[PDB]
Every structure is written in structure tokens, then in C-alpha cells.
Amino acid sequence: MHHHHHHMEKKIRVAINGFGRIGRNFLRCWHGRQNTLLDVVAINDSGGVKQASHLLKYDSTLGTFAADVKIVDDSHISVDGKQIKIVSSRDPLQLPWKEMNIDLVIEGTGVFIDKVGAGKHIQAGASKVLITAPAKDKDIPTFVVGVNEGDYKHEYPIISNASCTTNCLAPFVKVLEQKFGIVKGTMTTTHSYTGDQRLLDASHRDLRRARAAALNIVPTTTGAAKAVSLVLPSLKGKLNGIALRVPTPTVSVVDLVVQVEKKTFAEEVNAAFREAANGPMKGVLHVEDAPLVSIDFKCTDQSTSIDASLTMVMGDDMVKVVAWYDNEWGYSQRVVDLAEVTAKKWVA
Amino acid sequence: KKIRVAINGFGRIGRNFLRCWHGRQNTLLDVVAINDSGGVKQASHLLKYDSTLGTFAADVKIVDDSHISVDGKQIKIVSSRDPLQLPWKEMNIDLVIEGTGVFIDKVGAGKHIQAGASKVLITAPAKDKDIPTFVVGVNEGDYKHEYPIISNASCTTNCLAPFVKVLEQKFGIVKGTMTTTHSYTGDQRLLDASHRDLRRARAAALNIVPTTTGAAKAVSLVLPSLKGKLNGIALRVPTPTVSVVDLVVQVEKKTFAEEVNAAFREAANGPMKGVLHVEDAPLVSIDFKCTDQSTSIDASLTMVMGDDMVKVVAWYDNEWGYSQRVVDLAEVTAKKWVA
Amino acid sequence: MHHHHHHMEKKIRVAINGFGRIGRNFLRCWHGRQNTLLDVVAINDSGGVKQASHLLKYDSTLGTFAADVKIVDDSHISVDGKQIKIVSSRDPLQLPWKEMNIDLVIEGTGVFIDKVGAGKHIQAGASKVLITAPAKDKDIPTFVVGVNEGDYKHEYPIISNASCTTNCLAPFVKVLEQKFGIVKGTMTTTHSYTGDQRLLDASHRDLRRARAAALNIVPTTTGAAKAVSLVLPSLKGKLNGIALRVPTPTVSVVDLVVQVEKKTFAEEVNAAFREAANGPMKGVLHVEDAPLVSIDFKCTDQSTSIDASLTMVMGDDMVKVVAWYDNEWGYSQRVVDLAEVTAKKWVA
Amino acid sequence: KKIRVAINGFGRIGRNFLRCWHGRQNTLLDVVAINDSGGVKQASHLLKYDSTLGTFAADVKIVDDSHISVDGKQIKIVSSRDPLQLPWKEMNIDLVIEGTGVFIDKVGAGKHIQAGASKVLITAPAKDKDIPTFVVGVNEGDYKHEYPIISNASCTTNCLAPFVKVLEQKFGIVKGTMTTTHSYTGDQRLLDASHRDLRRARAAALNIVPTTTGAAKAVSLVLPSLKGKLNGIALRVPTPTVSVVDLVVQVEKKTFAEEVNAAFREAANGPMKGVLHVEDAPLVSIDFKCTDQSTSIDASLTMVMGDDMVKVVAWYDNEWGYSQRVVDLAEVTAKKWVA
Ligand SMILES: NC(=O)C1=CN([C@@H]2O[C@H](COP(=O)(O)OP(=O)(O)OC[C@H]3O[C@@H](n4cnc5c(N)ncnc54)[C@H](OP(=O)(O)O)[C@@H]3O)[C@@H](O)[C@H]2O)C=CC1
Ligand SMILES: NC(=O)C1=CN([C@@H]2O[C@H](COP(=O)(O)OP(=O)(O)OC[C@H]3O[C@@H](n4cnc5c(N)ncnc54)[C@H](OP(=O)(O)O)[C@@H]3O)[C@@H](O)[C@H]2O)C=CC1
Ligand SMILES: NC(=O)C1=CN([C@@H]2O[C@H](COP(=O)(O)OP(=O)(O)OC[C@H]3O[C@@H](n4cnc5c(N)ncnc54)[C@H](OP(=O)(O)O)[C@@H]3O)[C@@H](O)[C@H]2O)C=CC1
Ligand SMILES: NC(=O)C1=CN([C@@H]2O[C@H](COP(=O)(O)OP(=O)(O)OC[C@H]3O[C@@H](n4cnc5c(N)ncnc54)[C@H](OP(=O)(O)O)[C@@H]3O)[C@@H](O)[C@H]2O)C=CC1
């Protein structure tokens, strides 16, 4: 009944450093949101407007972008008329983030993942950096939306959104820990290949990731099960696992085997997941009842799809859970989500 | 002294079996007949040329309308969908290798004996429970000549049972679960199409495809102390051969990875030599193609959590390694042959 | 200025026999049309409502159907509330087409492709059969939309929509013949694998199609270049070719080399194609100027996409043209189109 | 009598070259040095284990921090991105096999001679026109010891030139076009990523990928009568090795398929024995893996339209068959070695 303006949440100015699989999935995820607090104003692409526009528009995994993608001039593209600056520097110290008034950098290079490296963006003028990967520094806080994003504070200048596998695992591990308690467990992710692997046998520090990715099942170490304890500290020292990279281009599946404290059975485990999916983890955790295969989970927005018919309990307290995740697109929706959290908590 | 063998079902396992047999230094098996509905043209061609085994180095020829020859040795080719119609009495067949995936129960496999064979070796789990099952390196000393129909189990049970036997002896298994990440097989569809299993209906080279497995339960057929202790699942993936078992077990004796691996090495160097291998190099699936062992423990992947949760990862060539076990089990029947 | 009703074009009652790749692509193509003269009332699926609904909804090539797919009862599914009968007979003589008042059968089995076999549907009660494949009988008329569908007559009870490759070739061959004249030519299609090939080396009358399809380049004979003369009779005896099946699941590309009568150059050839694309072959023939790869042509509605930068002319009169086609989806749009022609010409 | 060889670039061609050389009965080549930036660990491992060639049967060992051994024969491993820094004077290197794809022009390849080598053989088309190009079976009799830098052309030109030589001799080529349906190579990306060529940027195992080829024009370097007569394109497809050339030519002499094939058989049985093969069996790409010839005409695919339009389809293992030609051309330099 009073004289007032309308509430304005402020949009933060975002730059994407590294316009790779995750950088380009992030842009399409953002562009498809009905409402956003993010204004993407800059992209660092070594190939300039030609490469940025082409690889944004045409995608072997996602299909052709329905949006109108145009080259505006020699340093701008537009997406449905919204212009975005293209910069091209390998050294973040050289990026114009002070001049462009950048609030948040999405670090999707896989290169600047510790405080010194990501901090170069802040030295260059940005206020905050969100690393799309596990941090290389123990003191960089890590967040998984659906698990611990309420512990985010505006006063963290550098943050990590963890790995795709940790974003799959941690929501349903949180449910297991809440309902049944975890003693210890192991995980194997059967994971699509990524650009870190080689197309044909070739140079790599990892002699297994050196091997032809579309021809092989390729074991590789993973920090993702240990990393769950960065977001669920009660799980410190309780989980470990491995990865098997296989000849698919996206979608992965986690197989977790945990010993729980409370004796249970498969229907009760699934009921705990369904309760979470319908409530506090809606949009992050899904329980799938149809008999599907990996490609059915392409471009799904949730972090975790429990394959309900595969849930198994052995000897009362050994619980096996199988969960699908689109390691590109679902993970990128979580990057958008965590960037939106930083916008919501931005301090005046 | 040698026994006369017919192969029924000249598919992936039937053809791997012939090439495995042909490469043996010494054998008590005389392969004399192959039932292939494509006749000499198809049998000769797919024996010689193989997308995963490569070209057979033997000279493969079409002799006449019902014989091929392999390095000069003639094999009769027959073509009947009905085993009752096969000439096994005429040809004095001792042993039928059942590689069709169809005649896997006691009535079905028994048709070969009705047609005149003496014994049938099913290259698969049997459907009914009174057909004895054997895994070479685990319980083949329990085979008896009086068994007219026997099973060599599945590829996954042949990989699992040898190293589960070691774990049970050394540490004691309380319970466990397994996943096999498994190459696609001919039961799955190339593009989405009719299948009684709606996941196996889906394009095999495009997908990770979950499917049931009987292999964790089947271990208890050859290792009775494992009754009720294991369960698991398969994930079929877009590779054409070589598979990998990931087993997680709770054990009685608290342990650590090096000690688990040491138990496997003792077995690989002794009583399971040739069946169980421990691999120390950092390899990938294709490196285990055409390996003769049933199981290759990937040593650097062994993990122990909380003292008594043991994770073991083991590779197996589900075509070639399994078919070497089929040859081995058939050789056992020859050694114990009486009548 | 007079008392009148509105014009009513009649919808023909359609049954799909063989709910395979082409049968299911046909249903989705039809369902996505803004306006149609086709009412799909029956599907013959050996697996009943469970298999028909599941494989309609979930598709490894097309992705998940956005439409609401439900099992209504033991012999009906619904798509966005529209109910469709599921029948399951291997012998078309046994299908209930008289009882269901079927106008047109889409024959997508690959089995009933000559007059006796397709004619079993007419004996069963249908009025017309459209074979989604080359006919096995020389006297069954063949049509390619964009080429000769004006020669269709209601009085043909059995018709063929030719093969996917002939639907790619014939529109742009028609342009070449019109503008430059064809002396003779050869073609190779580099073609996705199909369900006729084997997953691992296994039984087949064709010893090359016996071989593992996702591991190999697989030569196979093709009638598709000769078949162009069924729709363009001036080309009788002038074309032949081969197929190479490769490890992709859909989209194919035709490489045609023709000797022409009129001396020409690449830009002039492409200009003839662009004139056709913009005019009489709009929606059937497309000229693509971007540097794309096979998966960019997935789910494209045209029959033919000329890769303009690959057009080459050697020695004045040897013309090489490269054209992309989605052998499942584009072909199925042409099946819908040819069925719509039969509806338009239906005689009162 | 033997010449001392260094391999610069231990990639697919560098490693195929070593295995091809090692399998020769007789050789005038002594491979003494390999430049691999991953050192002995990487060079030994990727030489032993290979996703398309399979495991090397030779004993491969790490001797010390700068030597491996292959069946006991030691090879020095060096690691410099800059050829000027390589120890070729110290090691008395005669011939460098340039397998990097980088030092393919006269300045770049010349750095190995500046560093002390006498001769460089580029395993690729050269970038500038005064580097002589040779295809074994076509023009290697034109090689001269006085040429310090030579090219062995591309895999596609090695497949094309031998049978184009036969067509030109027997029928006369007026003009023609070619497409190669070619396995992916390491220049392409695994998933969509940066590339100067926006089609080679795209996921290689998911796509048919058009790309330019110099091979049809390059035939005129080794066969001057072909100047200006051919053009063509490549389609990269999701297979890891083996490729196929489809050539369509207008010829002078009217002919028919059996006569074209007969010309190829005459050449395969005579002056191109070992380089050109004519295949009569109905095979697929994997059957031509690890074949030693440069070209396998698929006889049943030869087609003649309108009397003078000839279509020929020829298979080639773009890794192994090409590397056997690299070995052959290096052996020619050894036979003609003076100083
Ligand atoms: N793919 C996945 O499934 C997931 C990946 N991640 C993580 O996301 C990050 C990126 O992975 P992904 O997108 O797959 O890899 P890509 O290789 O596709 O993307 C990496 C991008 O960074 C660019 N880049 C590299 N170095 C620099 C530099 N110095 N300056 C500017 N741009 C640079 C590359 O371009 P150029 O070619 O110009 O170097 C490329 O565009 C990694 O940390 C990865 O671990 C996280 C979750 C899931
Ligand atoms: N592939 C693997 O990894 C393993 C498979 N197995 C088991 O081995 C068996 C065969 O498997 P695989 O070789 O992969 O399958 P394939 O489909 O390759 O071989 C099956 C063979 O049986 C033939 N066949 C089918 N029905 C009949 C019949 N009525 N009379 C005669 N021949 C017939 C088929 O020929 P046609 O085309 O003429 O029907 C084909 O040659 C199955 O039981 C399978 O579970 C066991 C371990 C591993
Ligand atoms: N795929 C392609 O790219 C193109 C294919 N075509 C043509 O379309 C036709 C179908 O090809 P495609 O869809 O790929 O093959 P599919 O194998 O996917 O579909 C064949 C369908 O017919 C069913 N079927 C077979 N026999 C019978 C029968 N007696 N009664 C009822 N249903 C039956 C099969 O089901 P079941 O498993 O129950 O037998 C299956 O659903 C073929 O003629 C093909 O040449 C044309 C253009 C392009
Ligand atoms: N593969 C094929 O089918 C054929 C390829 N070729 C030609 O052969 C050459 C190599 O091709 P391929 O073997 O496929 O490619 P690879 O990428 O497999 O091998 C290239 C090798 O060169 C090394 N290398 C690159 N730069 C340097 C450098 N500055 N100093 C030292 N080593 C270096 C790479 O190691 P690092 O990772 O350390 O850079 C890698 O080992 C190219 O010219 C190609 O066109 C010819 C015929 C056929």
C-alpha cells in the first residue's frame, strides 16, 4: 500500500575462460534458462570469432544450437542478438577484465586451477573465479549444489565446483549418510572419454590415457570419491575409487558400493532417494524407473539419475547404487547454478 | 585315444574354439564336423577372416559342397537347425561343443545324444540345475565321465571364480558385489530394434547398456562356500571383445592391497598358472586381446578400504580366453574318456 | 458472398507395417507436421504395446520423443493423447485392415516389397501400399518427391518411395541433367551402417555385410544409381555405383562423378543447385555453405544437402558433387510427403 | 655398408617404421637413435603396446635413462623439440626419418643436417617444391645420393600412384577425380575442439569428416604425365587404420572391367610385386590391416561406364603399408650411399 520500486537482483558480469566442452556447454545451459542473474559478456577463445561462433553453433554431442549465432565484428559474436566479446590471450594477466568490469570468471581451461593461476584473473581485474574442476589447492573451497552450497560465502574469491563424478556421487551419498550412515565404500565410474585422452596412441604423462580412446576401456585414477569429503566432511577417509573410460562421447555412470551402519534393503534405499528427489534435492537428484541406457541421459539437467532397478543390498549392510550423469551438460547446469549462487549472495 | 568332436554353432565361440584348438601343440581332440547353416561358403570365409582375431594363418579351403579343409585336414560341414537331424551316429561323434546359445537345457542338449553323440559340452551356463558346471582352475577335478551333458559356465564366471577362490582361501569372503564392464556381444542389437530385454534392444556401439548377469551367483556352483555371498550386474560398452570384472568383497581377515596381490601372484605362479595372471604394466583393454588366461588381475588397481573392503579389477578376453577354457574342458573329457 | 461450407481434404487412415528404424522415424516425422492429411491408426509391432511405446519414446539416434507416450491398454498406445492400435501378426493376410478401414499401409518391413507380398495387405483389406524401399517388381511404380511425384496416380495400388540414396541422388541429378545434360557417371555413397549388417562377424548372404559393422568400412552393392532411371527415364543405362558402409549410425554422403554435355565450372554447377533449392526443389534440395561434418545433418528434413565447397569440375565436363543425407530422418520425411500425395489425389 | 638411422618423431609412423624395420629379414639400416620427448618410459611403453598393431613380440626394455633395447639391441633416446640441439654429429647419424609432421620444409628438415646428419627422409609431402618426392614402385629409380632431403609422399599418394601408373600405361588417362575414405589420424580432435580446419576440429570417431587432400595432384610429382589431370577429396571416418581410394578416370582406350583388372594383375605379378596387390575375396577394411603392399585393388568393385569411365577401388593400410614404403625408400638410400 506504499510508494516503492520493484525488487532488483543484480546481474553479475561473467567471462568464460576456456571455451571448450565445459565452456560451450555452460553458455548453452545459461542461454536456455528462463531467468538468470548472469550476464555473459566475454569469452576467451584462441581461435577468435570464427572458431567461437562455429563451435558454439555446431556440436557433435549437443546438436546444432537453435539460437541465431552470428559474427558481429572482428571481436564480437552475438547469440540471438546478445553480443559477447571474444578475447584471445593465453596469459590471464593480459585479459582485459578491469576494463570490462568483470565480476566472475568461469575457469574452464583445466590450466588455472590453483590459487596462483586462478588468481591471475583477479590480478587482471576480475572479482571472483569459479573453477570448473577440482581445485589444485586444499584451501580453495569446493561446493556441490544440492549438498553444501549453503556454505558458500561472498568472501571466497576463488571456488571450485568439483568434478562431474563428485557432483554425481555427493548428492546420493548425502542421502545414504543421512538415512543409513556410511562405514566405508568404493566406487567405479564407467565414464565417457574426454579431451584429455588421445585419439590414437600418443604422448601422455598417463600411459593409459595415452591409448586410443574410442578403441579401449581405459582405467584411470580418480580423486572424485575422496573429494566427497570436501563437501561432506563426515566422509573423510571413508571412500575411494577408480575410473574406467569407455568409447562413448558423453554420459557416465557411477557404481558405488558402501557398507552402511543401518541394516536395510533395496526398496528402502530407493525410497530414501525418491524422498530426496521429490523434496530437498529436486532438480539435482532423479530416480529413474524405466529401463534406459546411457544415451537416454544425454542433456538431462539433474546431476544424478539413480537407476532404481539396479539398486542392490547384500548381507543387510552392503549397498550398491548405480547412477547416471551427463558429465558435460548436467555438470554445466551445476556450474550455472553455482554461479547463480554467487550472484544471489553478492555483497553490496 | 583322440575323441571325435562336432561343433554345433559356428559363431564367435564356435570359431574361436576351432582356432584355439588348432593352435594347440598337443591335443586329444579331433574336430571332424561343424554345423553351420551357411554351409562351406560361410564357414570357410568367416573362419579365415575375422574382425577381432585377424586373418587365420592356416590355409582354409572349400573341398566340396560339404567339406572344408584347414591346413589340409578335412572337416565335414552340416546344416540342420534341428540337432535330431544331425548325422552324429553315422560320423561316430564322441563330443558336441554346443555353441548355439539355443540347446542349453537338458532336453535341448540331449537331442545331440539322441542323434548319436555321446557327450555335450555347453559353452554357456546351463538352464536347468542338474547339468554339472565346471570352471578350469577351480573345480574341473570334479568332472566325471558319467556326466553326458556339462556346462563350462559363462566368460564372466570363468574370470571371477579363479580369483574369488584365492580370496576365499586367504581372507574369507563375507559378501560382495561385482560389476562387469563387458564388450558387446551378438545378443545385442546394432541399431535400436526388437529384443525381449529393452536395454539390449538399444544400439550396442553407441551405449553403455546395463544387463543382468548370473555370473556372481554361478560362482557358487563351482565354489560351494560362495553360496548366497555375491550378486552383481553387467554394463555392456562399445568395444568388440575384452571385458573387465570389478569385484568388491567384505573379507574376514583384515588386509591391505599388497598382501591381496601377493595371494594372487602365489596362485598365478603355482596352482593356477595359465588360468590366473597378475599384470603389473599399466595397460588397457586391447592389450588383453587373445590372451590365453581366464583372468588378468590389474595389480595397481587393487584397493582395500577400512581394512576389510577389498576391490579387485580383472581383465578377460571373453571370446578367446573363454574358448581356451572350452578347449581345456574338452581335453579333460578326452583324458577321462572310457565309454 | 454465398452460402457454403469450408473445404475439407479427407484424412486417409494409415497403418505402419514394420515399426523399425523407418517405421518409427516415419511416426515422429508425421507427428511433427503442423498440418497433415494422414491419420495413423495402427502399427504392427511384434513386441506389442510394451516394445512399441518404449522404442518410440527412447531412441539412440533421435533422442527422447518430447511427446507424451503412454500405454492405454493391452493393444493401444497413445501419443499426446492420440490413440493408436498395436497389432502383432507376421503374415499380413492376418492383419485386420478391413475391420479397421485402412486406406494406406506404410510397408517398412523390408520383407513385403513385391506385388505378391505387399498385395497381401490389400487382400487383408487395405486399399493402397507404399513400400519404404526399392520395389522387387519392375512394374511397381517408383517415386521421388521433388523429381517425379507429379506422375503419381490414384490408380496405382502399390508404389515405392525408392531407397534413401536414390532420394539423395535423384533431385540433384535432375538439376544436372536439365542444365548440363548427363553422358554417364558413377557414384559411391559413404553410408551409415543399418540393421541389415551384423554387430559382430556373423551369418549373412552377403559376406561383407556379415562383418562387424562398427569396426569396418564395408563395401556393398547398390541399385540406387541405376534406380535413378526409374524416376528420370532419360538416365537409363547412364549411372552406376557402389556403397561403403562405415561406423556411424545415421547420415550418409553421396559422391557423384558425371560426364556432362555442356562444358562448365564449379560455381556454375553450384548456381544451378542454388536456383533449384530456392525454387522448385525447396525443402528437398539444400545447398550448404558452412564447413560441416556428418552429424550436423542429423534430423535435417531435406533429401539432399550439397556440400558447395566440395563441388569440383575437371577437364570442363567431369563434374564431382558431394551431397549429405540423413538416411533415416530425411528419407522418412519423404515417405510422409509421398503418403500426403496419395491423400491429395485420393479419388472420390 | 649399413647406414646409421635416427627417427625424429616417435608417433604412429615413427613406431610403425621401427616395427616394420625390425621385422625385415635383411636390412642395410641400423636404427641407433629415437627422439621422443617422453623419454625412455614413453618410448618403450608405446613401442611394446599398440592399440592397432597389437603387442610387439620383441623384448622391449629400459636400459638406463637414455637407452631402450629391442631384443637386446640398444637404441639411444633423446628429447629435444629443436633439431639443432640433437646430437647427430656425435652419433655419426647418416639418415634422419622425419616423422614429426613439423620439419617438412627445406629450412626445417635442414636443421637435422646442421646438427650433423647427412640426409633426411620426410614421411610426408614436403612443403616446398624443390624437395624431391619418391613413391616406391613408381619412381624410386630416379633417387640420387646427392639429394640431402627427400619426401616419401603421403599414404594416399602411395596407394594411388602405383595403379594410376598402370592405368596411364595401358589405357591413357584424360582426367579424373578421387575420394579417399580414410581412417582418422592424430591431426583430428577426439571431441569438438580447436583446429585451424573447422571440420578436423570435430569429434573424429563420431563423424564423416571431409578434408582437402593433396594426393591427387601429388601424383604428378612422381608421374609427370599426370600433371593437371586429377583432383579429389578425403572423407575421414571412424576407423583407426586402413583407408580406401575410389578413383574415377576418363581413359583414352575404351575398355571393360575384366581388362582393367587384368592390367593390374600383370603389374602385381611382375614389376610391382610387393607394392600392388589384386584382391579377389570379398573383404572389409580390417582384413587389410598390417598388409605390406601399398595398394590392394578390390577386383570385384572395378566398374566401367560408357566404355571410357573407369572406377577403381583400392585399399591401403595408411600406417603399416606406408611405413613399409618408408623402410623401402630408406633402404634405397643405403644401397646408393656413397658419402
Ligand atoms: N568434459 C567433462 O566431462 C568435464 C570436464 N571438467 C573440467 O573442465 C575443464 C575443461 O575440460 P573440457 O572442457 O573437457 O576440456 P577442453 O579441452 O574441451 O576445453 C579446454 C579449453 O581451454 C582452452 N585453453 C587451454 N589453455 C588455455 C589458456 N592458457 N588460455 C585460454 N584458453 C585455454 C582450450 O582451448 P586451446 O585449444 O586454445 O588450448 C579449450 O578450449 C577441465 O578442468 C576438466 O577437468 C569438469 C567436469 C566434466
Ligand atoms: N561371445 C561371448 O563373449 C561369449 C558367449 N558365450 C556363449 O556362447 C554361445 C554362443 O555365443 P556367440 O558365439 O557369442 O553367439 P553367435 O551368435 O556368434 O553364435 C551363435 C551361433 O549359433 C548358430 N545357431 C543358432 N541357432 C542354431 C541352430 N538352431 N542350429 C545350428 N546353429 C544355430 C548361429 O548361426 P545362425 O546365424 O545360422 O543362427 C551362430 O553361428 C552363447 O550361449 C553365449 O552365451 C560364452 C562365453 C562368452
Ligand atoms: N534405415 C535406412 O537408412 C533406410 C531403410 N530403408 C528400408 O526400409 C525398410 C526397413 O528398414 P529399417 O527400418 O532400417 O530396418 P529395421 O530392421 O529397423 O525395421 C524392420 C522392421 O520390420 C519388422 N518386421 C520384419 N518382418 C516382419 C513381419 N513379417 N511382420 C511384421 N513386422 C516385421 C521388424 O520387427 P521384428 O524384429 O519383429 O522382425 C522391424 O521392426 C527396409 O526395406 C530398408 O531397406 C529405406 C531407406 C533408408
Ligand atoms: N598416420 C598416417 O596415416 C600417416 C601419417 N603420415 C605423416 O607422418 C607424420 C606423422 O604422422 P603421425 O605419426 O600420424 O602423427 P603423430 O602425431 O602420431 O606423431 C607425431 C610425432 O612427432 C612428435 N613431435 C611433434 N613435434 C615434435 C618436435 N618438435 N620434436 C620432436 N618430436 C616432435 C610427437 O610427439 P609430441 O607428442 O611429443 O609432440 C609425435 O610423437 C605427419 O607428417 C603425417 O602427415 C604419412 C602417412 C600416413
Author numbering:
A (entry chain R), C (entry chain R): -7 to 1, 1A, 1B, 1C, 2 to 18, 18A, 18B, 19 to 34, ...
B (entry chain O), D (entry chain O): 1A, 1B, 1C, 2 to 18, 18A, 18B, 19 to 34, 36 to 60, ...
Give the text the authors published on this PDB structure.
The crystal structures of CrGAPA complexed with both cofactors NADP+ and NAD+ (NADP- and NAD-CrGAPA) have been determined at a resolution of 1.5 and 2.2 Å, respectively. The superimposition of the two independent chains determines a root mean square deviation (rmsd) of 0.21 Å (326 aligned Cα atoms) and 0.30 Å (335 aligned Cα atoms) in the case of NADP- and NAD-CrGapA, respectively. In reduced and oxidized NADP-CrGAPA structure, the well-defined electron density allowed the building of the whole non-cleavable His-tag (MHHHHHHM) at the N-terminal end of chain R. This portion disordered in chain O, breaks the 222 symmetry of the tetrameric structure which became a dimer of dimers (C2 symmetry) and is stabilized by interactions with symmetry related molecules. The first one is sandwiched between the methyl group of Thr96 and the guanidium group of Arg77 in the NADP-bound structure or the hydroxyl group of Ser33 in the NAD-bound structure. The 2′-phosphate group in the adenine ribose of NADP+ forms a salt-bridge with the Arg77 and hydrogen bonds with Ser33 and Ser188 of the adjacent subunit, and various water molecules. In NADP-CrGAPA, Cys285 is the most exposed (average residue and thiol group ASAs equal to 67 Å2 and 20 Å2, respectively), while the catalytic Cys149 is less accessible (average residue and thiol group ASAs equal to 9 Å2 and 6 Å2, respectively). Incubation of CrGAPA with NADP+ partially prevented inhibition of the enzyme by GSNO, suggesting that NADP+, bound to the active site, might interfere with the GSNO-dependent inactivation process likely through steric hindrance. Consistently, if the cofactor is removed from the structure the accessibility of Cys149 increases (average residue and thiol group ASAs equal to 28 Å2 and 21 Å2, respectively). Based on the here presented NADP+-crystal structure, we carried out computational calculations to determine the protein residues contributing to the binding and stabilization of GSNO within the active site.
